[PDB]
Design an enzyme around this catalytic site. Structure first.
Site, mmCIF file in Angstrom:
data_model
loop_
_atom_site.group_PDB
_atom_site.id
_atom_site.type_symbol
_atom_site.label_atom_id
_atom_site.label_comp_id
_atom_site.label_asym_id
_atom_site.label_seq_id
_atom_site.Cartn_x
_atom_site.Cartn_y
_atom_site.Cartn_z
ATOM 1 N N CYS A 37 43.015 1.520 20.156
ATOM 2 C CA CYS A 37 42.389 1.104 21.467
ATOM 3 C C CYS A 37 41.537 2.289 21.823
ATOM 4 O O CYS A 37 42.008 3.392 22.050
ATOM 5 C CB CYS A 37 43.037 0.433 22.292
ATOM 6 N N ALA A 75 43.274 -3.076 18.460
ATOM 7 C CA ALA A 75 43.555 -4.395 19.195
ATOM 8 C C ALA A 75 42.568 -5.163 19.772
ATOM 9 O O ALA A 75 41.840 -4.627 20.837
ATOM 10 C CB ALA A 75 44.913 -4.166 20.165
ATOM 11 N N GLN A 109 42.929 -5.588 13.881
ATOM 12 C CA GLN A 109 44.135 -6.251 14.514
ATOM 13 C C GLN A 109 43.620 -7.003 15.466
ATOM 14 O O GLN A 109 42.902 -6.700 16.533
ATOM 15 C CB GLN A 109 44.672 -5.125 15.122
ATOM 16 N N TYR A 157 53.992 -6.821 23.425
ATOM 17 C CA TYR A 157 52.615 -7.926 23.763
ATOM 18 C C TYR A 157 53.367 -9.183 23.470
ATOM 19 O O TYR A 157 54.471 -9.441 23.202
ATOM 20 C CB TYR A 157 51.524 -7.493 23.029
ATOM 21 N N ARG A 184 46.419 9.524 15.699
ATOM 22 C CA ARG A 184 45.909 10.627 16.601
ATOM 23 C C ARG A 184 45.300 11.947 15.780
ATOM 24 O O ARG A 184 44.584 12.625 16.301
ATOM 25 C CB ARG A 184 47.129 11.395 17.365
HETATM 26 C C1 LIG Z 1 44.333 6.043 21.106
HETATM 27 C C2 LIG Z 1 45.715 5.002 20.818
HETATM 28 C C3 LIG Z 1 45.562 3.657 20.976
HETATM 29 C C4 LIG Z 1 46.334 3.061 20.216
HETATM 30 N N1 LIG Z 1 45.936 1.760 20.182
HETATM 31 C C5 LIG Z 1 47.064 0.776 19.377
HETATM 32 C C6 LIG Z 1 46.495 -0.650 18.938
HETATM 33 O O1 LIG Z 1 45.267 -0.791 19.221
HETATM 34 N N2 LIG Z 1 47.180 -1.145 18.235
HETATM 35 C C7 LIG Z 1 48.469 -0.847 17.869
HETATM 36 O O2 LIG Z 1 49.090 -1.605 17.057
HETATM 37 N N3 LIG Z 1 49.065 0.477 18.112
HETATM 38 C C8 LIG Z 1 47.966 1.231 18.692
HETATM 39 N N4 LIG Z 1 48.233 2.766 18.702
HETATM 40 C C9 LIG Z 1 49.411 3.249 17.818
HETATM 41 C C10 LIG Z 1 48.863 3.743 16.715
HETATM 42 O O3 LIG Z 1 48.163 2.708 15.732
HETATM 43 C C11 LIG Z 1 49.965 4.470 15.974
HETATM 44 O O4 LIG Z 1 50.870 3.723 15.592
HETATM 45 C C12 LIG Z 1 50.377 5.913 16.652
HETATM 46 O O5 LIG Z 1 49.394 6.406 17.403
HETATM 47 C C13 LIG Z 1 51.267 6.744 15.983
HETATM 48 O O6 LIG Z 1 50.439 7.363 14.823
HETATM 49 P P1 LIG Z 1 50.205 8.965 14.908
HETATM 50 O O7 LIG Z 1 51.423 9.758 15.271
HETATM 51 O O8 LIG Z 1 49.576 8.956 13.619
HETATM 52 O O9 LIG Z 1 49.109 8.990 16.117
HETATM 53 C C14 LIG Z 1 47.376 3.296 19.393
HETATM 54 C C15 LIG Z 1 47.564 4.823 19.503
HETATM 55 C C16 LIG Z 1 46.800 5.562 20.181
HETATM 56 C C17 LIG Z 1 46.961 7.064 20.005
#
Ligand SMILES: Cc1cc2nc3c(=O)[nH]c(=O)nc-3n(C[C@H](O)[C@H](O)[C@H](O)COP(=O)(O)O)c2cc1C
Ligand SMILES: Cc1cc2nc3c(=O)[nH]c(=O)nc-3n(C[C@H](O)[C@H](O)[C@H](O)COP(=O)(O)O)c2cc1C
Lengths: 359, 359
Positions: A24, A56, A98, A182, A325
Site C-alpha cells: 500500500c 491491496a 492483490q 481484514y 521494504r
Molecule cells: C509500505 C507497506 C505496505 C504494505 N501493504 C500491504 C498490502 O497492500 N498487502 C499485503 O498483503 N501486505 C502489505 N504489506 C506487507 C508486505 O507485503 C510484506 O509482507 C512486509 O513488508 C514484509 O516484507 P519485508 O520485510 O520484505 O518488507 C505492506 C508492507 C509495507 C512495508
C-alpha cells in the site's frame, strides 16, 4: 543462483524468483490511482524483479483500509491501471494485483497520519463491516456492523467484479487478500467470527466465505493465469498448533479449488499476540504449509538480505521470495541481489540504458 | 552534513547539494522522449536529489549524438517534456536540462550497439558539422563538414530556440553543453578548430562561438533562473597548463556574461590522451577553476561514495556534487548517502510512502 532461476506457473513465466509483494502506498484519491503509482510501479518493474504485485486494491469503497487506498470497484477505476500494467509488461516483469476488503480494519488513517480509526465526525470516515460486531481494539476501536447474507453475497460479487476488471486491465497474476485481519481472515478466525449461521461456527462454516469467494473468482479469472491468495496461517496467540492445523486444511481446500500458489503470512486478527519477529522468521512455517498442502508458496519479512532469499529457495522452504521494504529503499534491489550472489552479467538484471554502464 | 545543506542560486533553492548530472538514455525516437524518460526522471526526482539535469538534448536533429538522443528542436519536442518537468517538481527536485549539439561526434551508434560512427549506407545516419573538416579518429572516423557562417548563425539560433522552449516547458535550470568534444568544445580547442575566420585562430576567436551562444541564450533565458554550462577545461594531452589557463580565462568571460555556475569536466576533444581516472580525480581542477574564476562549480566522476562528496564540499572544491552512475544503480542514492553520513531522519530524504517504513 536459485534466486535467478525462472519460474513457470500456469502459462506465466517469471524471469527470476524475486516477487515484490503488495505494498500500500496510500496515494490514491477516491480509489483512483495516479502518477504516484505509475512511476512507482514502472520503476520497480525495471529494477529486475520477476513479479510485481500491486498493493491491496479495494473491491468496494468501504473495503479500503484508508482514504488513500487504491480501488477497483468500477470500470473507471480499472481503466486507470491499464497504462501501468502495460509499463510493467514493457519492463519484462509480470504484473499482478492483490484485491482486498479491509473489513473491520477499514476507515483508518494513513500510517503517517495517526494509523488509527478515523474519528466519528471526520467527513472522510465510513462504517465498517465484518462477520460479527466485535472491534479489533487498540488503535482500531470501531465496532463493525455485522454482515447480512445479502452483504456477504454483495462482497463476493465485488471480488468477482474486481477479478474480471483485473483480467481485462491485463494483469497476469491475481492475489486474494485473505490475510492480515481484514475481511477474509476475519471470517476464518474464531476470534472475530462469532456467527451462528452458515458462515460461522464450524471449520467448514468459517472457511465458507473464503472458499465461495475463491470459487466465484475462478469463474471469471482465466484458467491459464495464476490464481493465488495471501492467508494468515497462525496468529502467535497461544493457539498456534490448532490454528496452523486448520489453516493447512484450508490450504488443501484452496489447492483443490484451483489455487496455484499461497502467500503465507500471519493473521494479525487481534492485537494481543506475541510475534517472534526476525529475519526470514516465516520460512519454517511456509515450508510446513508447502509440504503438508503440497502447494507452492511465497512468504516475506527480512528477505532483503540476498543470501537469506537464496538459502530459503535452496532449502525448498519457498518457491518465490517476497522482498518488500528493501524495494522501497532501493527500486533496483534485484540488481544488488544479483551482484551479492555472483550472478554473471549482474548489471543486465537492469535495462540496457543502466546495464551497459554498470557492467 | 554539507551534502544535505540547501543551495540557492538566483531564485532557485535546491534542497541539498546532490546534483544528478545529465545522462543520455538513448531511448528517444526522432528526438521525442517517452515513458522511458518520464519514469526514469520522476523516479530519480523522488529519490531525494536537489537537482536533476535532463540528459543532453539536441538543439537540432544533426546535433544528436545518436538516433536515440532526445531533442528539443521543435515545439512538439518541447511539449513532450512538460509532464516530466511537472513530475520532477511534484517530487521537490529542481528540473534542469542540458541542451547540446554533438558536432563531429554526432551520427553515432548507441553505446551498446557499437558506439561508433554509423555506416555510410545505414539509413539512420547523417552528415556531421564542425568548426573544421577534421575527424576525431578512432571509432569516430567520419570527417565532418566545415560550418559556414550561416551554419554558425543557425546553430546559435537553435540554442536560443532550445532555451526558449526549455523555459516554456517549465525548466528552472539550464546547462549549455560545451564539453566532451561536442560542437562547443570543438570550437574552443586548437586540436579541432583550424578556422582562419572570426571563429578560429586566436583565443578570442576560438571563444567566440561559445560566448555568442551564451549571450544569445541569455536574451531568452530568465535572469532569475540559473544559467550554467558544462565545459572541458583540460584534455590530458600534454598541454594541460596552457589549456587550463585559457579555459579559466574563458570561465571568467562566462561569469562576466551571466553564467551562474560551471560544471567542470574534461574535454575529450581527441582520442590520444592519458586521463588519470580515479575517485573524485576532478576535485582539484574544479577547485582551481572555482578559485581563479570566482565562479561556483560542480564536477563528477566517482562521487557515489558519500564521504568523498562530503569531503569535497567541506573543502570548498565544489558547490554541488554531481553523482551519475550511482543513481543508475540506485535511484534512491540520496537516501543511501543520508544514512551513510548520519543525517537525522535519513529516510525522510524520500517521500512519505517510503520514508515512514524505513525510519
Ligand atoms: C509500505 C507497506 C505496505 C504494505 N501493504 C500491504 C498490502 O497492500 N498487502 C499485503 O498483503 N501486505 C502489505 N504489506 C506487507 C508486505 O507485503 C510484506 O509482507 C512486509 O513488508 C514484509 O516484507 P519485508 O520485510 O520484505 O518488507 C505492506 C508492507 C509495507 C512495508
Ligand atoms: C549513461 C551516461 C550518459 C551520460 N550522458 C551525458 C550527457 O548527456 N551529458 C554530459 O555532459 N555527460 C554525460 N555523461 C557523464 C555524466 O554526467 C558524469 O559526468 C559521469 O558519469 C561521471 O560521474 P559518475 O562517476 O558519477 O558516473 C553520461 C554518463 C553516463 C554514465
Amino acid at each position: 543462483s536459485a534466486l535467478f532461476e525462472p519460474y513457470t506457473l500456469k502459462d506465466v513465466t517469471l524471469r527470476n524468483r524475486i516477487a515484490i509483494p503488495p505494498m500500500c502506498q496510500y496515494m490514491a484519491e477516491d480509489g483512483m490511482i495516479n502518477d504516484w503509482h505509475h512511476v512507482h510501479l514502472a520503476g520497480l518493474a525495471r529494477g529486475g524483479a520477476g513479479l510485481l504485485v500491486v498493493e491491496a486494491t479495494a473491491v468496494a469503497p468501504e473495503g479500503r483500509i484508508t482514504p488513500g487506498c487504491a480501488g477497483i470497484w468500477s470500470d473507471a477505476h480499472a481503466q486507470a491501471f491499464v497504462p501501468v500494467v502495460q509499463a510493467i509488461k514493457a519492463a519484462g516483469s509480470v504484473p499482478g494485483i492483490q484485491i482486498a476488503h479491509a473489513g473491520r480494519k477499514a476507515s483508518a488513517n494513513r500510517p503517517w497520519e495517526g494509523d488509527d480509526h478515523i474519528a466519528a465526525d471526520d467527513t472522510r470516515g465510513w462504517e465498517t463491516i465484518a462477520p460479527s460486531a466485535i472491534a479489533f481494539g487498540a488503535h482500531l476501536p470501531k465496532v463493525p456492523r455485522e454482515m447480512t447474507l445479502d452483504d456477504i453475497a454483495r462482497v463476493k460479487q465485488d471480488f468477482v467484479d474486481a477479478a474480471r476488471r483485473a483480467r481485462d486491465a491485463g494483469f497476469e497474476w491475481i492475489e486474494l487478500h485473505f490475510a492480515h485481519g481484514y475481511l477474509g481472515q476475519s471470517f476464518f478466525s474464531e476470534h472475530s467470527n462469532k456467527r451462528t449461521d452458515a458462515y460461522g461456527g464450524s471449520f467448514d462454516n468459517r472457511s465458507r466465505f473464503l472458499l465461495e469467494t475463491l470459487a466465484a473468482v475462478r469463474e471469471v479469472w482465466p484458467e491459464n493465469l495464476p490464481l493465488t491468495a495471501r492467508f494468515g496461517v497462525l496468529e502467535y496467540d497461544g493457539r498456534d498448533e490448532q490454528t496452523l492445523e486448520e489453516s493447512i486444511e484450508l490450504a488443501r481446500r484452496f489447492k483443490a479449488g484451483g489455487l496455484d500458489l499461497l502467500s503465507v503470512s500471519v493473521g494479525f486478527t487481534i492485537p494481543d499476540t506475541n510475534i517472534p519477529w526476525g529475519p526470514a522468521f516465516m520460512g519454517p512455517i511456509a515450508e510446513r504449509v508447502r509440504r503438508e498442502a503440497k502447494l507452492p508458496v511465497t512468504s516475506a519479512w527480512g528477505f532483503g538480505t540476498p543470501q537469506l532469499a537464496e538459502a530459503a529457495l535452496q532449502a525448498n522452504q519457498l518457491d518465490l521470495v517476497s522482498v518488500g521494504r528493501a524495494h522501497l529503499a532501493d527500486p533496483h534491489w534485484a540488481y544488488f541481489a544479483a551482484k551479492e550472489l555472483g550472478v554473471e552479467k549482474a548489471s543486465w538484471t537492469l535495462p540496457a540504458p543502466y546495464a551497459h554502464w554498470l557492467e
